């Protein structure tokens, strides 16, 4: 429930870091055997 | 040259989110055709 939010929050930084827009940036979680993997990936 | 800090930058705000630490955190650059891509991968 807050972890969405934090991945809203880590495309507001990447915006602002490499002046991208939201559009350019992909955020999404993947299970890697007993944990999981966030990934990110940007547009530049 | 500004890109390695931001990229650092990433790591402190990751680490600061999902409370992991830097050697969870993997950042790279990717081209991909006539742009580049940058990925974040997280251990959670």
């Given at each position: 429930d807050?972890?969405?939010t934090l991945r809203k929050?880590?495309?507001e930084v990447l915006?602002?870091?490499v002046?991208?827009?939201l559009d350019?940036?992909?955020?999404?979680?993947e299970k890697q055997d007993?944990?999981?993997v966030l990934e990110l990936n940007?547009?530049?």
């Open positions: 807050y972890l969405p929050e880590l495309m915006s602002k870091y002046n991208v827009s350019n940036i992909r955020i999404s979680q007993g944990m999981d940007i547009t530049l």
